Amino acid sequence: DKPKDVSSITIIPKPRLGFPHGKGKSDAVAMRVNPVALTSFQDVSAYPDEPRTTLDIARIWGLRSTFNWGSGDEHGKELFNTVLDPGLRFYDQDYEGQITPMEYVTGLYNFWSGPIELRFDFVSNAFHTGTVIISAEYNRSSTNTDECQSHSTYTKTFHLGEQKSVHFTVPYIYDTVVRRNTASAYLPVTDYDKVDNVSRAQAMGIRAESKMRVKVRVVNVLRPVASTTSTIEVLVYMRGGKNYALHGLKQSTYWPSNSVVPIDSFPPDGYDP
Amino acid sequence: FSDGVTAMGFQSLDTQVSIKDILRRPVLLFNHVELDPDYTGFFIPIMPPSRMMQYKSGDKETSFQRLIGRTPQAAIMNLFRFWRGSLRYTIIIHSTDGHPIYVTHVPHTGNRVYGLMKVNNLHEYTKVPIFGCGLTTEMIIPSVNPSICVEVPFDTENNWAVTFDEDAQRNYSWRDKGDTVTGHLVVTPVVSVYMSVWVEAGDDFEVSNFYGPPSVKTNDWNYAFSDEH
Amino acid sequence: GDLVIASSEPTQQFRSLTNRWMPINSIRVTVNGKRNDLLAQYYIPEDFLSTHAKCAPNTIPFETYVYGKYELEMKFVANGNKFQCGKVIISVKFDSYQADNINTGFQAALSRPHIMLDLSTNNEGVLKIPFRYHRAFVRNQTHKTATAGVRPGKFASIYVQVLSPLQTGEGGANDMFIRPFYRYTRAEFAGMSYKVPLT
């Protein structure tokens, strides 16, 4: 017999399935003998100590900045002073160097939130002695010569001696649940084009510059013995907190600046000597 | 001080922190590039986006998209020098004709090429097409569907594929030179027509050998106003 | 996993020879040295066979076997005085061949497996190196009859870098010394051949 098929349904045809998404469904055709066969990760697989998320990379300690602390530095003097924004290192000049893991990875997202961790390693010996005060300052900033303004905020005083390192969690205290990135979402300028106001007027967005600052001031002046160095370097490490968050994938603000060469056809393009 | 509470889940449940999830969303490679039937076909080397495909102001003009190096997943792949598993290539032919456009997979042969190429420098390939040599092939029929998504396997000798080198144009040991790819994907038309190509990681895909962040530069500040005019 | 497939014949260990401590060349750190400067670097195993400690009994099995898998352990001993100060970092980069000149800063070192040495306290540091290579085995030695298509004797690179410059007191010493020591925790050899001189 050849009976008629009365079953039918209305459909909406799409060219690709799950094209925008990173997960869900896919209509990909395997270029294999067996269409459901996959790569084996029985022996060769990802090592357990490797980072699985962007947040895992942000939890790696990275050397942000350095500063010197000497016996000549009078009390109340700013040894360190920066806007701590993981979006951009500077708002008013170009950057070139080794950016920290958490800054690199934060540069891929339009939004960030949660506390930021700092670690101050004093490159000294047992004969160095002194005290500094680390301060997290929000909304309103302190004068360079007014130590009292810094003391009125969220502070941690460290007595340098036998211990040569101190940890500092910078609280997240803002008017919004997340902060948008100060870097651009999309920048088509590739050939260092000389900027004008019309270029800026037709930008992707407006840079919401942070006024949140972390400072280090002298409490007790450094008083080392005559036999050792009078000045020491302090290494400032940075990473995302345990509840550091990222969202809204965008164009990367940072890109390789060293040993960048585009691929060519091997061996057609003059490889045969 | 307090660790506080995470913002993850507050705005939405669409988490975008997973490395695999970032690598599985597509990257444009070629934007409206020509296919010519005088050649064997347009070669696409099977490798993820990275610093290997980064444009530098001044260097010779390629067919590649300039902003591949600035994509999230390219920045991620610059941290991992090993990758294993399948990649997925979304190819769109700019046509509505009934001519079939064939996409042939070549396994790891040891070379590394891209763009239009005459294999063994002949001047005729209609009688000896690459898609009818024996290799695995799939056809696009633009009248039906101008797009396709094909998943290429990890057909190589090595445990891992090498993501990048310090210099991509350096003439070193020839067997090692080809270990940055796991094969090729060759598109062959009937008549002259344009195409666009995207790439992403497959479901069966892993990265390893973490290298940490490289030396970088930015000038994003300069092309934007602040919130105080 | 890959060991049993890659080699049809069984692999061999020589713990008595390979799993002993062996010192290599001395490293000099001066006050002139800046942050990010390479004090020393080692392509392994190559440099432990044919440059450093060439007459070591650790190197004897490499003469006869063509392939192997290698897990190492490297101890570093510093000797600066209590009136000096400074920081040195030692890190490992797996499968570094034609990628030594990138991701090669102090920041990359802090990301990868590493150890940190304070030059005043003289704390010892021990970095553990597993075998992470894109092939099943690494080749031990080059030869005239052997192919030049595969560059042998390099599955990883070790970097010794200045993190914070050496400083000293008035009329103090302008330098101090660090000594590395190496040993194989797991050296499996494969593919027996006639004995040859190393490089």
């Binding site: 003059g270 000597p273 | 070193y172 | 030594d100 560059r151």
Partner: peptide, 24 residues
């Protein structure tokens, strides 16, 4: 014309020498 490095800083295999520390 950068197809290979100069002979001062290289080990036969046309790569940076382990002796040449100033590469960084």
């Amino acid at each position: 014309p950068h197809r290979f490095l100069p002979a001062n800083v290289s080990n036969r295999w046309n790569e940076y020498s382990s002796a040449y520390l100033p590469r960084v």
